[PDB]
C-alpha cells in the first residue's frame, strides 16, 4: 500500500484519466494525491481524492522573463508539494517537466504517464513536430531526438540551477538523464496507437483511462429527439477552447456547412478572440449551442463527431464508435488527425470553411465502411482495461523504476 503522487499540468482534460487511475489505485488500497493547478481542486477532490496546488499552468503562457518565471513556480511549488508529502511512487505527465528530478532527490521510483508519442520510435514522429505528410520512419525518430535536446535545451540552464541550488543534486544533461529508460505508461488505445516493434519493454500502451449519472436539461433531450423525429442526422461540434480571429464567421462557417449537410447539431462552441462570449449569430432551429455535456453520455447518443482532436476526445469517440472528423489546432491534435485518417475511422480537415466540413458531415454521416471500422475499433476499445492495464504495470515495474531512479542518483 504506496503513497502516490499523480502529477500534470494543463487541461481538465489531461487531469481526468489520473483521477480515473486514481480512484482504481486507491481501490487497490494505495493512497492519491493528484498534484495539479488550483482551478481542479474542486474536480479532484469531488472524486474523494487528494489535490496540490501548483503553478506552470500552460494558459499562463497563451497570454521571456514570464516564461522564464512561469517555470520557476512550477519548480518551486512542485518540490515543496512532492518534498513535503514524500510520495513512495511518483507518476508524471513528462509536459510537466519537474519529475524526473525529484525522484531522483526524493530517490523514489518514478514513472511517466502521456497521451501522445513521446519516446523515441521509427513508427511515430514527436507529437509536437508531426509532419505534414507521413515522411520516413527515420524523420519520426529523429523529430524525437530533436525535440527532446530543443525542450531541454530551452529549460536546461534553470533545471540545473533548480537543481543544484533547490534539489541539492548535481547539474546533469539528456545523456545522463537517460529519459527513455524511465517507465512508459501510455493512457492510449493500442487500436488507435498500436506499440512500435522499437518500444522498450518499460513503454507500455495500456489502453485508456475513463473515469465512470448524467441528468440531460430538457433543452437537450427534445433537442435530440427533434433530430430523430425529423429523420435527420445528429453531429456534435465542439473544438474546445481555442482563440480564432473572426469568431463570427467562424460561427456562421459552422451554421452554413450545418445546413448544406443537413444535419442537427449539439454544439459545444468554445471559440472567442481573448482566452475566456459564446451567441455571436442568432442559432438555427436544428443547431443546439450548450455548455458541457459528459462526452461519455452524448457520444453513444450521436451519429458523428467533430472535434479538435485531443487524445481524450479522440478517445471518447472512437469510444463510443463515432465516425469522427478532427480539425487539430495545437499539439497531439495533429497526430490524432493523422492516425484517425490512417485507422479509416474518420476525416482530417486542415481547412475549415463550409464547403470542407459539410463534405466531411455528409462523408461521416453516410460513409458505410467509416461507420464499420468506427465499430471495430469501438469492440477493441470496449474489450481493453486501460486502468488494469496500467496499474498491473505499475506494480511489475516498480523494482525497474526504482533502479532507474537510482541510477540517477549520487
Known amino acids: 500500500s504506496y503513497k502516490f503522487g499523480l502529477l500534470t499540468i494543463g487541461s481538465r482534460g489531461d487531469v481526468q484519466p489520473y483521477i480515473a487511475l486514481g480512484k482504481g489505485l486507491i481501490k487497490e488500497g494505495h493512497q492519491v494525491v493528484i498534484i495539479t493547478h488550483s482551478e481542479f481542486r474542486d474536480f479532484v477532490e469531488s472524486h474523494g481524492i487528494q489535490f496540490e496546488e501548483i503553478a506552470g499552468n500552460p494558459v499562463e503562457l497563451m497570454s521571456s522573463s514570464k516564461f522564464r518565471g512561469w517555470i520557476d513556480a512550477l519548480l518551486q511549488t512542485s518540490w515543496e508539494v512532492c518534498n513535503r508529502r514524500k510520495f513512495d511512487i511518483l507518476i508524471e505527465s513528462p509536459s510537466a517537466m519537474v519529475g524526473i528530478h525529484i525522484t531522483e532527490a526524493l530517490q523514489i521510483?518514478?514513472?511517466?504517464?502521456f497521451t501522445m508519442p513521446w519516446t523515441r520510435t521509427r513508427a511515430y514522429p514527436h507529437a509536437f513536430i508531426v509532419p505534414d505528410q507521413k515522411r520516413g520512419g527515420n524523420y519520426n525518430?529523429?523529430?524525437?531526438?530533436?525535440?527532446?535536446?530543443?525542450?531541454?535545451?530551452?529549460?536546461?540552464?534553470?533545471v540545473n540551477k533548480w537543481r543544484v541550488e533547490t534539489l541539492g543534486l548535481g547539474k546533469t544533461n539528456l545523456f545522463?538523464?537517460?529519459?527513455?529508460?524511465?517507465?512508459?505508461?501510455?493512457?492510449?488505445?493500442?487500436?488507435?496507437?498500436?506499440?512500435?516493434i522499437d518500444f522498450s519493454e518499460w513503454v507500455r500502451v495500456t489502453g485508456y483511462w475513463f473515469l465512470d449519472t448524467f441528468k440531460p436539461p430538457a433543452e437537450l433531450q427534445e433537442f435530440i429527439s427533434e433530430a430523430r423525429s425529423k429523420g435527420k442526422k445528429?453531429?456534435?461540434i465542439g473544438f474546445g477552447s481555442i482563440v480564432v480571429s473572426n469568431a463570427k464567421e467562424m460561427t456562421e462557417a459552422l451554421v452554413e456547412a450545418v445546413m448544406e449537410a443537413d444535419v442537427y447539431c449539439i454544439l459545444n462552441k468554445g471559440w472567442s478572440e481573448r482566452l475566456g462570449k459564446k451567441t455571436e449569430v442568432d442559432l438555427p432551429?436544428?443547431?443546439?449551442?450548450?455548455?458541457?455535456v459528459p462526452h461519455d453520455w452524448l457520444f453513444p447518443q450521436v451519429d458523428a463527431a467533430v472535434h479538435h482532436g485531443g487524445s481524450g476526445t479522440t478517445g471518447a469517440s472512437l469510444?463510443?464508435?463515432l465516425p469522427t472528423v478532427i480539425k487539430p489546432f495545437f499539439g497531439d491534435q495533429f497526430f490524432y488527425a493523422g492516425r484517425v485518417e490512417d485507422i479509416g475511422v474518420g476525416i482530417a480537415l486542415k481547412k475549415l470553411n463550409a464547403q470542407t466540413l459539410a463534405d466531411a458531415l455528409k462523408v461521416a454521416t453516410t460513409n458505410k465502411i467509416m461507420k464499420d471500422r468506427a465499430g471495430l475499433i469501438k469492440k477493441k476499445i470496449s474489450k481493453e482495461d486501460g486502468i488494469k492495464t496500467a496499474i498491473s504495470a505499475i506494480y511489475n515495474e516498480l523494482e525497474y523504476a526504482r533502479s532507474v531512479t537510482l541510477s540517477r542518483v549520487k
Open 141 to 158: 525518430y529523429l523529430t524525437h531526438v530533436l525535440f527532446e535536446n530543443v525542450f531541454w535545451k530551452g529549460i536546461s540552464g534553470q
Open 285 to 292: 432551429r436544428n443547431i443546439l449551442n450548450i455548455g458541457n
Open 109 to 113: 521510483p518514478y514513472f511517466r504517464a
Open 176 to 196: 545522463l538523464l537517460q529519459q527513455n529508460n524511465v517507465p512508459f505508461l501510455y493512457n492510449v488505445s493500442p487500436t488507435i496507437f498500436p506499440p512500435s
Open 319 to 321: 469510444r463510443a464508435g
Open 234 to 236: 445528429l453531429v456534435y
